[PDB]
């Protein structure tokens, strides 16, 4: 979830979404 890191940086965690990668 390299891309998710962008938004995740704000204050979220990297989880396994329906597709594969997604911030919680």
Task: Count the alpha carbons within 13 Å of 2 in the hemisphere toward its beta carbon.
Answer: 0
Give the span between the Cα atoms of 10 and 18, in whole angstroms.
22
Give the span between the Cα atoms of 22 and 6, in whole angstroms.
11
- Secondary structure element (H or E) that encloses residue 15, with its range: strand 14-15
Helices (H), 1-24: 5-11
* Residue 17, CA distances (Å) to 11, 20, 23 in order: 17, 5, 8
Q: How many CB atoms lie within 10 A of CB 8?
A: 17
Q: Are 23 and 4 in contact (CB under 8 A)?
A: yes
* Residue whose token pair is 């997604």: 22
18 φ, ψ (degrees, to nearest 5) = -65, -40
């Amino acid at each position: 979830c390299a891309d998710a890191v962008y938004t995740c940086r704000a204050g979220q965690t990297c989880c396994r979404g329906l597709h594969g990668y997604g911030c919680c």
